[PDB]
Design an enzyme around this catalytic site. Structure first.
Site, PDB file in Angstrom:
ATOM      1  N   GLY A  15       0.775  -1.239   0.000  1.00  0.00           N
ATOM      2  CA  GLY A  15       0.000   0.000   0.000  1.00  0.00           C
ATOM      3  C   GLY A  15       0.804   1.286   0.000  1.00  0.00           C
ATOM      4  O   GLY A  15       1.985   1.302  -0.360  1.00  0.00           O
ATOM      5  N   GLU A  16       0.130   2.363   0.399  1.00  0.00           N
ATOM      6  CA  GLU A  16       0.699   3.707   0.482  1.00  0.00           C
ATOM      7  C   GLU A  16       0.729   4.184   1.934  1.00  0.00           C
ATOM      8  O   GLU A  16      -0.322   4.387   2.548  1.00  0.00           O
ATOM      9  CB  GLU A  16      -0.148   4.685  -0.342  1.00  0.00           C
ATOM     10  CG  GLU A  16      -0.254   4.367  -1.832  1.00  0.00           C
ATOM     11  CD  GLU A  16       1.018   4.647  -2.620  1.00  0.00           C
ATOM     12  OE1 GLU A  16       1.994   5.198  -2.064  1.00  0.00           O
ATOM     13  OE2 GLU A  16       1.042   4.314  -3.825  1.00  0.00           O
ATOM     14  N   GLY A  17       1.933   4.343   2.479  1.00  0.00           N
ATOM     15  CA  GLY A  17       2.138   5.058   3.748  1.00  0.00           C
ATOM     16  C   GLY A  17       2.209   6.559   3.509  1.00  0.00           C
ATOM     17  O   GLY A  17       1.958   7.031   2.397  1.00  0.00           O
ATOM     18  N   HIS A  18       2.566   7.310   4.548  1.00  0.00           N
ATOM     19  CA  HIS A  18       2.577   8.779   4.478  1.00  0.00           C
ATOM     20  C   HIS A  18       3.696   9.337   3.598  1.00  0.00           C
ATOM     21  O   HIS A  18       3.428  10.101   2.665  1.00  0.00           O
ATOM     22  CB  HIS A  18       2.640   9.393   5.877  1.00  0.00           C
ATOM     23  CG  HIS A  18       1.323   9.391   6.587  1.00  0.00           C
ATOM     24  ND1 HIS A  18       0.366  10.365   6.387  1.00  0.00           N
ATOM     25  CD2 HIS A  18       0.795   8.527   7.483  1.00  0.00           C
ATOM     26  CE1 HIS A  18      -0.690  10.100   7.134  1.00  0.00           C
ATOM     27  NE2 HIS A  18      -0.454   8.992   7.812  1.00  0.00           N
ATOM     28  N   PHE A  19       4.938   8.955   3.905  1.00  0.00           N
ATOM     29  CA  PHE A  19       6.110   9.330   3.094  1.00  0.00           C
ATOM     30  C   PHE A  19       6.642   8.159   2.263  1.00  0.00           C
ATOM     31  O   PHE A  19       7.860   8.033   2.086  1.00  0.00           O
ATOM     32  CB  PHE A  19       7.274   9.827   3.968  1.00  0.00           C
ATOM     33  CG  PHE A  19       6.925  10.928   4.925  1.00  0.00           C
ATOM     34  CD1 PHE A  19       6.227  12.060   4.508  1.00  0.00           C
ATOM     35  CD2 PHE A  19       7.360  10.858   6.246  1.00  0.00           C
ATOM     36  CE1 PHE A  19       5.935  13.081   5.406  1.00  0.00           C
ATOM     37  CE2 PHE A  19       7.078  11.875   7.142  1.00  0.00           C
ATOM     38  CZ  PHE A  19       6.363  12.988   6.724  1.00  0.00           C
ATOM     39  N   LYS A  21       5.774   4.097  -0.135  1.00  0.00           N
ATOM     40  CA  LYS A  21       5.065   2.864  -0.465  1.00  0.00           C
ATOM     41  C   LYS A  21       5.544   1.715   0.421  1.00  0.00           C
ATOM     42  O   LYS A  21       6.731   1.625   0.737  1.00  0.00           O
ATOM     43  CB  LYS A  21       5.292   2.506  -1.935  1.00  0.00           C
ATOM     44  CG  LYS A  21       4.712   3.468  -2.940  1.00  0.00           C
ATOM     45  CD  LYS A  21       5.007   3.050  -4.378  1.00  0.00           C
ATOM     46  CE  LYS A  21       4.391   4.009  -5.388  1.00  0.00           C
ATOM     47  NZ  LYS A  21       4.691   3.625  -6.797  1.00  0.00           N
ATOM     48  N   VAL A  22       4.605   0.861   0.823  1.00  0.00           N
ATOM     49  CA  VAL A  22       4.894  -0.382   1.540  1.00  0.00           C
ATOM     50  C   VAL A  22       4.748  -1.521   0.537  1.00  0.00           C
ATOM     51  O   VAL A  22       3.755  -1.576  -0.193  1.00  0.00           O
ATOM     52  CB  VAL A  22       3.924  -0.607   2.723  1.00  0.00           C
ATOM     53  CG1 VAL A  22       4.315  -1.839   3.529  1.00  0.00           C
ATOM     54  CG2 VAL A  22       3.897   0.610   3.638  1.00  0.00           C
ATOM     55  N   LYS A  41       9.121  -0.713   3.671  1.00  0.00           N
ATOM     56  CA  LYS A  41       8.647   0.638   3.405  1.00  0.00           C
ATOM     57  C   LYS A  41       9.809   1.494   2.911  1.00  0.00           C
ATOM     58  O   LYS A  41      10.895   1.468   3.491  1.00  0.00           O
ATOM     59  CB  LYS A  41       8.027   1.238   4.665  1.00  0.00           C
ATOM     60  CG  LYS A  41       7.264   2.529   4.419  1.00  0.00           C
ATOM     61  CD  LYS A  41       6.534   2.987   5.666  1.00  0.00           C
ATOM     62  CE  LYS A  41       5.715   4.229   5.374  1.00  0.00           C
ATOM     63  NZ  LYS A  41       4.892   4.649   6.537  1.00  0.00           N
ATOM     64  N   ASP A 132      -2.074   9.915  13.181  1.00  0.00           N
ATOM     65  CA  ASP A 132      -3.016   9.315  12.239  1.00  0.00           C
ATOM     66  C   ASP A 132      -3.493   7.967  12.747  1.00  0.00           C
ATOM     67  O   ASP A 132      -3.385   6.944  12.053  1.00  0.00           O
ATOM     68  CB  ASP A 132      -2.407   9.186  10.838  1.00  0.00           C
ATOM     69  CG  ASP A 132      -3.449   8.853   9.766  1.00  0.00           C
ATOM     70  OD1 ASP A 132      -4.667   8.926  10.036  1.00  0.00           O
ATOM     71  OD2 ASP A 132      -3.036   8.514   8.643  1.00  0.00           O
TER      72      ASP A 132
HETATM   73  C1  LIG Z   1      -5.151  -6.674   2.610  1.00  0.00           C
HETATM   74  O1  LIG Z   1      -3.963  -6.397   1.852  1.00  0.00           O
HETATM   75  C2  LIG Z   1      -2.869  -6.025   2.567  1.00  0.00           C
HETATM   76  C3  LIG Z   1      -2.364  -4.728   2.498  1.00  0.00           C
HETATM   77  C4  LIG Z   1      -1.250  -4.363   3.251  1.00  0.00           C
HETATM   78  C5  LIG Z   1      -0.631  -5.295   4.097  1.00  0.00           C
HETATM   79  N1  LIG Z   1       0.515  -5.066   4.890  1.00  0.00           N
HETATM   80  C6  LIG Z   1       0.941  -3.879   5.486  1.00  0.00           C
HETATM   81  N2  LIG Z   1       0.420  -2.671   5.241  1.00  0.00           N
HETATM   82  C7  LIG Z   1       0.886  -1.572   5.843  1.00  0.00           C
HETATM   83  C8  LIG Z   1       0.278  -0.258   5.549  1.00  0.00           C
HETATM   84  C9  LIG Z   1       0.135   0.175   4.217  1.00  0.00           C
HETATM   85  F1  LIG Z   1       0.549  -0.600   3.193  1.00  0.00           F
HETATM   86  C10 LIG Z   1      -0.441   1.410   3.950  1.00  0.00           C
HETATM   87  C11 LIG Z   1      -0.872   2.220   4.992  1.00  0.00           C
HETATM   88  C12 LIG Z   1      -0.732   1.797   6.306  1.00  0.00           C
HETATM   89  C13 LIG Z   1      -0.165   0.567   6.601  1.00  0.00           C
HETATM   90  F2  LIG Z   1      -0.043   0.190   7.898  1.00  0.00           F
HETATM   91  N3  LIG Z   1       1.897  -1.615   6.714  1.00  0.00           N
HETATM   92  C14 LIG Z   1       2.473  -2.757   7.016  1.00  0.00           C
HETATM   93  C15 LIG Z   1       2.021  -3.939   6.413  1.00  0.00           C
HETATM   94  C16 LIG Z   1       2.836  -5.037   6.934  1.00  0.00           C
HETATM   95  O2  LIG Z   1       2.697  -6.197   6.603  1.00  0.00           O
HETATM   96  N4  LIG Z   1       3.744  -4.594   7.819  1.00  0.00           N
HETATM   97  C17 LIG Z   1       3.595  -3.142   7.939  1.00  0.00           C
HETATM   98  C18 LIG Z   1      -1.148  -6.591   4.134  1.00  0.00           C
HETATM   99  C19 LIG Z   1      -2.252  -6.955   3.388  1.00  0.00           C
END
Ligand SMILES: COc1ccc(Nc2nc(-c3c(F)cccc3F)nc3c2C(=O)N=C3)cc1
EC number: 2.7.10.2
Length: 282
Positions: A15-19, A21-22, A41, A132
């Protein structure tokens, strides 16, 4: 701990974090596949984003709690002259993604709320504010264990507040943040209330804080969304009671949304309360 860039095989975006991509990588030094799956990240960005990203790593390096996402290490980013942040991979993802596709019982939702508060009580004792706290930043480890992610906006409280910038999740923000640009520990508790509202709606898009607040404000005058939000909240208007939310839980929600910040409970005050409310509905 140092993750070598050569052994990271990207699987997919998360996904998208603040600063930044994850993304989901498999880290495989053996070349076998045994090597673990990790959430990585990375920074995208301008000068002020680089300063914040380094602080996010600094913050998350020092945090250690069962309801905060595990820091694992750093990976050197030759591609961005930066440092990529390696964390544990939570396959179930956020509550925002999870709860729409799984009918979760009220008791289980209250446990998550308790767990979030315990993690936030910890954060506040380390003298950090989150800024947040939202369902999108609560990651499900398993059916009975959630973890707080995304500390991109997180900041060191020296002073009882941090003075914020003019990106800002306004629909999760207390009047003092919106009006006076001061983020208190009590401002995270306001956000928790909204996060708790999100949980009890099962993060249904149609009942979301942006949707419900923009229904109240209207979009005929978009330039004054924040001012109209501020005025609405100072007038005592609040997000409605979610369907099948117990009255007492909604009162707790309302106490988190007290206009005067001192009248809100701390996260330490909330923990015992949620424990009791959980055991009640379990
Ligand atoms: C349902 O499909 C998904 C999507 C993302 C994840 N996994 C994660 N997503 C975030 C994430 C983000 F991508 C955006 C905004 C905020 C967040 F916390 N952060 C983390 C993780 C992780 O596994 N460890 C830290 C797992 C399954």
């Amino acid at each position: 701990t140092v993750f070598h860039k050569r052994y990271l095989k990207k699987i997919r975006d998360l996904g998208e974090g603040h600063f930044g991509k994850v993304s989901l990588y498999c880290y495989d030094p053996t070349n076998d596949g045994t090597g673990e799956m990790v959430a990585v990240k990375a920074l995208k960005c301008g000068p002020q984003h680089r300063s914040g990203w380094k602080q996010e790593i600094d913050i998350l390096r020092t945090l250690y709690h069962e309801h905060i996402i595990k820091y694992k290490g750093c990976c050197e980013d030759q591609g961005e002259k930066s440092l990529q942040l390696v964390m544990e991979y939570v396959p179930l993802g956020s509550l925002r993604d999870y709860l729409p596709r799984h009918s979760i019982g009220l008791a289980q939702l209250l446990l998550f709320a308790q767990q979030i508060c315990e993690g936030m009580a910890y954060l506040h004792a380390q003298h950090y504010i989150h800024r947040d706290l939202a369902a999108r930043n609560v990651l499900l480890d398993n059916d009975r264990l959630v973890k707080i992610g995304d500390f991109g906006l997180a900041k060191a409280v020296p002073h009882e507040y941090y003075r914020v910038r003019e990106d800002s999740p306004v629909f999760w923000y207390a009047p003092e943040c919106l009006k006076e640009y001061k983020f208190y520990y009590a401002s995270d508790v306001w956000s928790f209330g909204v996060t708790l509202y999100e949980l009890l709606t099962h993060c249904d898009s149609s009942q979301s804080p942006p949707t419900k607040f923009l229904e109240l404000i209207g979009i005929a005058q978009g330039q004054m969304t924040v001012l109209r939000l501020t005025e609405l909240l100072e007038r005592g208007e609040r997000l409605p009671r979610p369907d099948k939310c117990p009255c007492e839980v909604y009162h707790l929600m309302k106490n988190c949304w007290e206009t005067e910040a001192s009248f809100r409970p701390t996260f330490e005050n909330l923990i015992p309360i949620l424990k009791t409310v959980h055991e009640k509905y379990q």
